[PDB]
Amino acid sequence: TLLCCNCGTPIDGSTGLVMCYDCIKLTVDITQGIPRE
């Protein structure tokens, strides 16, 4: 029972997790620093 704390609306689990899946998909990136060609 938390809030997505970026958008707000997504009440997620307390298994140990962060802002909403859509929010981490669209805003957060962890593949930077590479050319794709």
Partner: protein, 224 residues
């Protein structure tokens, strides 16, 4: 309401401040911006004190206080005790505790009526807590995190915990403390809510990265 600020460049306010329903504490570190964020929404019935206990700026974690008492560790000196006593109302009694867990603000999550506390505190210290602050104590944990005053922010109107807290844990704790809780975060995912922010009955202060989704919960849980 909830203000947002930074002590120097830190978004952690509960580390450098200790806010109650009758007094407040701050660290002497400049930033009149940081001091105005308290002076603004307050009256002269709440006196602010610029202090540094044990030669430290980490006062909100090294202290734990209420609206009628203040607990400080054995490492602070008579000079600081006296600057506090000559600058704080006489309605509170200050006591220099003499126990191991020097970080009182991490091991005590206190308000006017109830006090979550760390398990391994001495039985002669918990009784002093009850004596001074005038409070009943409970000693379990938050959700395995035994640092209650750091992983749980709390008032008499509302309470907040970190996002690992089970729903059974929330129900149990809300029943014991007799105030509704809710398990969110602050300053963009910072699970350390008892330190990343600080709250009163009619006031909260967080960091500039405390976004509006977090401020909404903070203004929903604590106003009531």
């Amino acid at each position: 309401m909830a203000t947002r600020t930074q002590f120097e460049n830190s978004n952690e306010i509960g580390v450098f401040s200790k806010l109650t329903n009758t007094y407040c504490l701050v660290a002497v570190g400049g930033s009149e911006n940081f001091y105005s964020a308290f002076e603004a929404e307050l009256g002269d019935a709440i006196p602010i004190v610029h202090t540094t206990i044990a030669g430290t700026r980490i006062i909100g974690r090294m202290t734990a206080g209420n609206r009628r008492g203040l607990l400080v560790p054995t490492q602070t000196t008579d000079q600081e005790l006296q600057h506090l006593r000559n600058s704080l109302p006489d309605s509170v009694k200050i006591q220099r505790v003499e126990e191991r867990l020097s970080a009182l603000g991490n091991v005590i999550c206190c308000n006017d009526y109830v006090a979550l506390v760390h398990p391994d505190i001495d039985r002669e210290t918990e009784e002093l807590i009850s004596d001074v602050l005038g409070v009943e104590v409970f000693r379990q944990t938050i959700s395995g995190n035994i640092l209650v005053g750091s992983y749980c922010s709390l008032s008499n109107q509302g309470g907040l915990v970190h996002p690992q807290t089970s729903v059974q844990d929330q129900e149990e704790l809300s029943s014991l403390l007799q105030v509704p809780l809710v398990a969110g975060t602050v300053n963009r995912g910072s699970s350390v809510v008892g330190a990343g922010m600080v709250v009163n009955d009619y006031l909260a202060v967080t960091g500039l990265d405390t976004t509006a989704p977090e401020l909404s919960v903070i203004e929903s849980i604590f106003r009531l």
